[PDB]
Design a protein around this ligand. Structure first.
Ligand code: CLA
Ligand code: CLA
Ligand code: CLA
Ligand code: CLA
Ligand code: CLA
Ligand code: CLA
Ligand code: CLA
Ligand code: CLA
Ligand SMILES: CC(=O)O[C@H]1CC(C)(C)C(=C=C/C(C)=C/C=C/C(C)=C/C=C/C=C(C)/C=C/C=C(\C)C(=O)C[C@@]23O[C@]2(C)C[C@@H](O)CC3(C)C)[C@](C)(O)C1
Ligand SMILES: CC(=O)O[C@H]1CC(C)(C)C(=C=C/C(C)=C/C=C\C(C)=C/C=C\C=C(C)\C=C\C=C(/C)C(=O)C[C@@]23O[C@]2(C)C[C@@H](O)CC3(C)C)[C@](C)(O)C1
Lengths: 62, 89, 148, 176, 73, 80, 171
């Protein structure tokens, strides 16, 4: 399940980290469109290591 | 329409006539056709390999030419027999 | 043995005979086996006879003359052309146009093995008809063995 | 007893029998155990006949009115050109038998076959019904083991001719 | 006549001699369709008779192949 | 001698180098700083790993049949 | 349901309700091939043979027209095709036969595609076919029956004639 410190696999095809594993940092509960904030160990082509995804775009890996 | 799934195609793919033929009949026809083709080849081979007497391309015979076309038909018929067998007919 | 007749020794007592067990190993093909048994038997009967008659008499004609064909066996080679070829043609046509279609029917359960429409000269009583069928089968087996 | 030679453990050091389970790549490119089993049986059965044949011919046996050849490695050509008719008939039958083996059975390479590897429907003597289970299984093992032996023997023959001295015991027997 | 009679071999008889000088009748032949193979000795080029036969054969193949698709018949 | 025998030499040496390299990369991947160990090699470990490549043919096959060499569609792919 | 002609075999069904259906199709061609094609073929073959047989016998019993090309002199019904084809008679009739046959091909295509043209119908001389369907059907059977006989007849005439070089009797 998506929750703090959980590990998930990205399912957004446009993501640099598609089919890769990241750690959910925090999940906002205010109804924002993309609540989960996942952090990755690899920088993207822009140099970022984090992005916000929706719960459906994330599948828990364990 | 002709799209199929599984391990064997439907009989509709065999055309409007063979789709109604029994598997055994097709097999008999296949074997016979292959035989004719092989016979034609062997016989023609002798003509080509006989000393002289084949000048002006006398070795080409209308019957053997037609018979040789059995080979391709043999392939088709044998494949069709399998399809019919699997289809149950 | 339950499905088909036979299984009776020439004497008349029950004698189920299938040492190799072919029927069980190849059951779906038993109908073909029965048809071939009758075919071989009928052919054998005709062959047993005739041989004797070849010796006694001959068709009017030089080729058929005893002098021309002293040995009944030699007829095959001597009359290979002309006769023999004629017989070959008609027998072959029969198998392709009649026997083959008939077998296909029996393989689907529409024809009893051996039937070719000559029951018009057969007895109406089922029991007597059955007896005649048995007579045919037994005689055929004897004839086949007789021929060789 | 299973693999009495290997103390009762399956002998697949290379792991050929698990390559169909490689999930990374080459989908359906490795034979399923069923295909492998059938191949082993066919190879063994053919090897047994072949070995007997070489032995018989070398021992000096010759069928009445048969093609005459001296080299067991070149006799096939002689038969083909000496008795074309016979060769053809046998070839036809062999081909029918080979195709009938899978035509009705199904795909064993992908493990979707229905037949039990090794069954060609040739139990004409009906032993399968005339013998006890244990006897049948024993014979199956004997067939496989004897077949495997013949395969090794055929290899020895090939090696002997190709690599001089590769097999020493047979040389002692005075083969080549 | 040979074409319709079926005696097509006539059209391949008497091929040009190896001493034929191109553009002239010296050493010429009468054949129109042949499968000699190789090159004319003097012009060092493929025989014209062979090319004619080539195109004739290709013609039949294509004409037959053009009767494969359904077209309102 | 012209090609086959010398060819085996190249394959053996090349595989050795590739195998040992992959081994080291995977080994240091789980370290405190996986990127510092690529610019500043840990010589002691590298030497150990390098010596273990003489049997690369055997090791590779074993890894293949153990489903530890080839990955399974859990890798990044393009949008289409 | 067993066939009338071959009582020991099943009846060919697709041929039911057709003129001249005596239940005779041992090899079951009807079960596979389109019936309309088969029917058209039987009729055409019959009509052609009927005329062919007549012509063969007529010429054999003399009949040559006047004036007759010299090349056509001393020719039996057999051994006449080649002399004629050289003169031009065969080619001059082939042209017209071809024309009709091509238009007929179009008709056959439409028949098979479903147009309503009964196999073998070219709308010619239907006036003499009678009015009641019954009489129309009898006429059709008459044609078919004569046609089947003609096919066999022609075969005998040509084969026996060439094999034994004989005239009208046993041509
Ligand atoms: C009925 C059995 C049978 C079979 C299967 C064959 C098969 C063959 N004969 Mg043979 N033959 C036979 C009976 C038979 N013969 C008899 C009774 C005689 C009388 C003596 C001969 C006399 C004879 C002579 C004199 C010669 C042959 C030759 C050949 C080969 C020619 C192949 C060829 O040109 O085809 C090419 C045509 C094709 C369509 C190619 C595709 C078909 C396949 C790929 C070819 C192989 C056929 C296949 C093995 C049939 C078995 C399986 C079948 C169920 C599919 C072929 C292996 C010739 C040869 O090559 O000998 C060296 C040759 O010279 N035969
Ligand atoms: C591995 C070879 C292979 C196999 C197994 C198939 C399998 C099939 N093909 Mg196919 N095909 C292939 C190669 C193959 N194709 C190639 C290389 C070509 C040429 C490019 C074709 C051209 C082709 C056509 C044009 C048709 C098929 C059709 C069919 C289907 C019915 C087979 C049939 O009726 O044959 C029996 C065929 C005959 C008895 C006719 C023989 C004529 C000879 C070969 C000339 C079946 C799914 C048919 C189909 O799917 O119908 C919709 C169809 O109409 N195939
Ligand atoms: C109609 C004109 C014509 C003529 C006179 C020739 C003449 C020739 N052809 Mg050729 N050919 C033609 C049209 C023609 N071809 C076409 C249209 C094709 C395509 C199908 C071919 C395909 C062809 C092949 C594949 C071969 C020839 C071969 C030959 C040579 C010997 C056979 C022969 O004379 O006929 C003999 C034919 C008959 C007596 C009747 C045939 C009737 C058919 C079956 C209908 C000879 C040079 C053979 C040769 O020598 O080349 C190696 C050869 O192998 N031809
Ligand atoms: C398997 C059976 C069989 C076979 C193969 C032959 C074969 C032969 N017989 Mg023979 N024959 C047979 C049975 C058979 N016979 C019987 C049962 C009789 C009477 C009891 C005869 C009486 C007979 C005579 C008198 C003569 C021969 C002769 C011959 C030889 C010349 C051709 C011929 O048949 O003559 C013609 C044979 C007959 C007219 C016999 C009648 C045909 C049989 C009895 C009925 C067959 C059933 C029926 C016709 C099925 C037809 C359906 C068909 C479409 C398949 C030939 C070798 C002649 C010869 O030269 O011998 C050396 C000769 O002079 N046969
Ligand atoms: C893979 C099996 C195999 C193959 C391909 C051959 C192939 C051949 N054998 Mg051979 N043979 C075999 C098994 C085999 N044999 C076995 C198991 C035996 C022991 C019974 C023999 C006994 C044998 C003898 C005695 C002769 C051959 C001969 C031959 C050649 C002619 C074909 C023949 O007569 O068939 C052999 C017949 C059978 C295999 C079955 C008959 C029962 C041919 C090269 C003949 C030959 O050319 O001599 C050099 C010959 O005279 N073979
Ligand atoms: C691309 C070529 C091609 C294809 C698609 C097929 C396809 C088929 N063959 Mg086949 N076959 C081929 C070439 C081919 N054949 C050749 C070259 C030969 C030797 C001349 C054979 C000899 C052969 C036999 C002997 C048999 C088949 C059979 C079959 C069918 C059963 C499936 C199978 O693997 O067996 C299948 C429709 C079997 C079948 O069902 O018979 C029709 C069968 O018993 N094949
Ligand atoms: C028309 C005759 C005929 C028929 C109906 C069958 C029918 C069958 N055969 Mg087949 N078969 C035949 C001739 C025939 N076979 C011939 C002539 C040979 C070789 C000479 C074979 C070799 C053969 C093998 C090797 C196998 C079959 C098998 C099978 C069955 C699956 C199927 C019912 C299969 C079977 O019984 O599965 C266990 C099987 O594996 N057949
Ligand atoms: C399959 C049909 C057919 C074919 C191919 C031929 C072919 C031939 N006929 Mg022939 N013929 C036929 C039917 C046929 N006939 C019929 C049905 C009759 C009965 C009247 C005749 C009466 C006939 C005579 C009297 C003569 C020929 C002659 C000939 C030869 C020269 C062609 C000619 O002059 O035609 C002439 C054909 C006719 C005048 C036929 C009569 C008109 C027909 C019946 C009407 C056609 C209906 C449609 C339009 C040629 C071999 C001539 C020849 O060379 O003899 C050696 C010749 O003298 N035929
Ligand atoms: C505009 C218009 O409306 O015009 C009308 C005109 C008209 C005339 C009204 C019309 C028509 C109909 C036509 C044209 C009808 C003609 C039909 C025709 C011409 C029918 C022949 C059959 C031949 C047979 C059966 C042969 C038997 C031969 C047999 C059975 C033999 O055994 C011969 C034999 O040789 C063997 C084989 C062996 C020999 O040893 C022995 C003998 C010799 C005995 C049409 C269609 O309505 C059109
Ligand atoms: C995938 C593919 O391509 O398949 C195609 C292949 C192909 C061939 C295109 C097809 C076709 C069309 C057909 C029907 C092909 C079959 C056969 C073909 C090629 C053509 C037909 C008949 C030839 C005849 C009747 C011979 C006349 C020949 C005659 C009457 C003669 O022999 C005259 C002659 O005798 C004299 C009088 C005296 C002799 O001394 C000299 C000779 C012997 C020469 C198919 C089968 O539909 C599909």
């Amino acid at each position: 399940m998506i929750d703090r410190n959980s590990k998930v696999r990205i399912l957004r095809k446009e993501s640099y980290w598609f089919n890769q594993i990241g750690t959910v940092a925090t999940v906002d509960q205010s109804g924002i469109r993309y609540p989960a904030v996942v952090r990755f160990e690899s920088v993207n082509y822009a140099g970022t290591n984090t992005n916000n995804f929706a719960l459906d775009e994330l599948v828990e890996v364990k | 329409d002709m799209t199929w799934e599984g391990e064997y195609p439907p009989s509709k793919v065999l055309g409007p006539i063979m789709s109604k033929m029994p598997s055994g009949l097709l097999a008999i026809i296949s074997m016979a056709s292959l035989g004719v083709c092989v016979y034609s080849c062997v016989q023609t081979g002798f003509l080509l390999r006989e000393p002289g007497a084949i000048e002006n391309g006398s070795w080409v015979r209308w019957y053997y030419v037609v018979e040789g076309l059995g080979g391709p038909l043999a392939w088709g018929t044998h494949v069709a027999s399998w399809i019919q067998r699997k289809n149950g007919m | 043995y339950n499905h088909n007749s036979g299984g009776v020794n020439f004497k008349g007592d029950t004698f189920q005979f299938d040492p190799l067990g072919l029927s069980e190993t190849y059951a779906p093909l038993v109908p073909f086996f029965r048809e071939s048994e009758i075919r071989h038997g009928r052919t054998a009967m005709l062959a047993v006879t005739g041989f004797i008659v070849q010796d006694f008499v001959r068709i009017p004609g030089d080729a058929y003359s005893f002098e021309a064909v002293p040995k009944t066996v030699g007829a095959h080679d001597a009359l290979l052309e002309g006769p023999m070829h004629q017989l070959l043609l008609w027998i072959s046509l029969w198998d392709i146009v009649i026997t083959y279609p008939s077998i296909q029917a029996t393989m689907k359960g529409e024809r009893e093995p051996g039937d070719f429409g000559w029951k018009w000269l057969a007895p109406k009583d089922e029991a007597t008809l059955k007896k005649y069928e048995m007579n045919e089968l037994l005689n055929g087996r004897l004839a086949m063995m007789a021929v060789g | 007893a299973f693999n009495p030679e290997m103390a009762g453990e399956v002998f697949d050091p290379m792991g050929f029998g698990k390559m169909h389970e490689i999930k990374g790549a080459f989908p359906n490119m490795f034979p399923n155990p069923q295909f492998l089993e059938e191949s082993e049986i066919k190879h063994g059965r053919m090897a047994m006949l072949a070995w007997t044949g070489v032995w018989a011919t070398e021992s000096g046996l010759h069928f009445p009115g048969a093609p005459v050849a001296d080299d067991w490695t070149t006799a096939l050509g002689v038969w083909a050109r000496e008795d074309p008719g016979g060769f053809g008939i046998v070839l036809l039958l062999l081909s029918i038998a080979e195709g009938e083996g899978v035509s009705h059975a199904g795909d064993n390479f992908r493990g979707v076959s229905k037949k039990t590897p090794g069954d060609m429907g040739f139990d004409w003597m009906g032993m399968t019904k005339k013998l006890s289970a244990d006897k049948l299984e024993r014979y199956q093992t004997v067939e496989k083991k004897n077949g495997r032996a013949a395969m090794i023997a055929m290899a020895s023959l090939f090696a002997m001719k190709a690599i001089p001295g590769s097999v020493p015991i047979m040389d002692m027997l005075g083969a080549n | 006549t040979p074409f319709f009679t079926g005696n097509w071999t006539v059209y391949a008889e008497n091929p040009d001699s190896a001493t034929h000088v191109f553009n002239t009748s010296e050493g010429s032949g009468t054949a129109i369709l042949t499968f000699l193979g190789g090159f004319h000795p003097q012009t060092q080029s493929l025989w014209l008779s062979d090319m004619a036969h080539h195109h004739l054969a290709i013609a039949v193949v294509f004409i037959v192949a053009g009767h494969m698709y359904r077209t309102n018949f | 001698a012209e090609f086959i025998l010398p060819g085996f030499g190249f394959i053996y040496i090349s595989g050795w180098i590739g195998w040992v390299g992959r081994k080291y990369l995977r080994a240091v991947s789980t370290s405190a700083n996986p990127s510092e160990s690529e610019i500043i090699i840990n010589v002691p470990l590298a030497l150990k790993i390098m010596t273990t490549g003489y049997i690369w043919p055997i090791s590779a096959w074993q890894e293949l049949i153990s489903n530890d060499l080839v990955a399974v569609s859990e890798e990044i792919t393009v949008s289409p | 349901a067993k066939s009338k002609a071959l009582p020991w075999l099943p009846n060919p069904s697709n041929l039911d309700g057709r003129i001249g259906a005596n239940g005779f199709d041992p090899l079951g061609i009807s079960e596979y091939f389109p019936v309309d094609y088969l029917v058209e073929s039987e009729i055409k073959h019959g009509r052609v043979c009927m005329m062919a047989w007549a012509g063969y016998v007529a010429v054999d019993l003399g009949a040559r027209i006047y004036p007759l090309p010299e090349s056509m002199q001393g020719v039996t019904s057999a051994t006449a095709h080649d002399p004629a084809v050289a003169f031009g008679s065969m080619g001059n009739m082939f042209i017209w036969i071809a024309l009709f046959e091509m238009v007929g091909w179009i008709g056959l295509s439409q028949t098979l595609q479903g147009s309503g043209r009964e196999p073998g119908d070219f709308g010619w001389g239907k006036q003499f076919m009678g009015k009641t369907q019954a009489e129309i059907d009898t006429m059709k059977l008459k044609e078919l029956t004569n046609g089947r006989a003609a096919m066999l007849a022609f075969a005998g005439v040509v084969t026996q004639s060439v094999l034994y070089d004989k005239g009208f009797p046993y041509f």
